[PDB]
């Protein structure tokens, strides 16, 4: 709560969970980033840049690749199609 406060007051603070020995819980595959963007490019998204210029947000997201597809992380090669 102290971190989330100081971020809202206009000072984001990084890497405080590396040694704190308390990882905030998140589902399988994703781990707690700090300051991730809300418009994470997923597997069935349009490549539409310089539009999601919202504030940076705390939360958990997939690894560097490993895009999102219906509440899990999967590598971009295994992206499905939709019909």
């Amino acid at each position: 709560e102290y971190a989330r406060t100081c971020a809202q007051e206009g000072m984001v603070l990084y890497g405080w969970t590396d040694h704190s020995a308390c990882s905030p819980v998140c589902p399988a595959g994703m781990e707690y980033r700090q300051c991730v963007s809300p418009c994470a490019r997923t597997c069935q998204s349009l490549h539409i840049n310089e539009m999601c210029q919202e504030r940076c947000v705390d939360g958990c997201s997939c690894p560097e690749g490993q895009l999102l597809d219906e509440g899990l992380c999967v590598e971009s090669t295994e992206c499905p199609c939709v019909h």
């Binding site: 709560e1 989330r4 905030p24 819980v25 998140c26 589902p27 994703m30 980033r33 991730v36 809300p38 994470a40 947000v57 705390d58 939360g59 958990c60 997201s61 509440g71």
Partner: protein, 82 residues
């Protein structure tokens, strides 16, 4: 009473999931509410409601000494009878 799926967008409210965390945005009405994985609640609220709102999250002036304006309109010191 009817259980509905998610996402959901009715009536100016977008019930979504951002960054693993559930979100309920009401930017037309002027609020954003999200719950995290541990169950902790959070409410972001616009400056339109400055010293206007009151409730369990108090009012939105700057002073913290007067966040206990009861529903009767009086101050308090015990957090509970508030």
């Amino acid at each position: 009473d009817q259980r509905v799926s998610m996402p959901y967008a009715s009536k100016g409210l977008y019930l979504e999931t951002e960054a693993g965390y559930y979100k309920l945005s009401g930017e037309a009405y002027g609020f954003v509410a999200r719950i995290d994985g541990s169950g902790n609640f959070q409410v972001l609220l616009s400056d339109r409601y400055f010293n206007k709102t009151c409730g369990l999250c108090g009012n939105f002036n700057i002073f913290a000494e007067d966040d206990f304006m009861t529903q009767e309109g009086t101050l308090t010191s015990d957090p509970y009878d508030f």
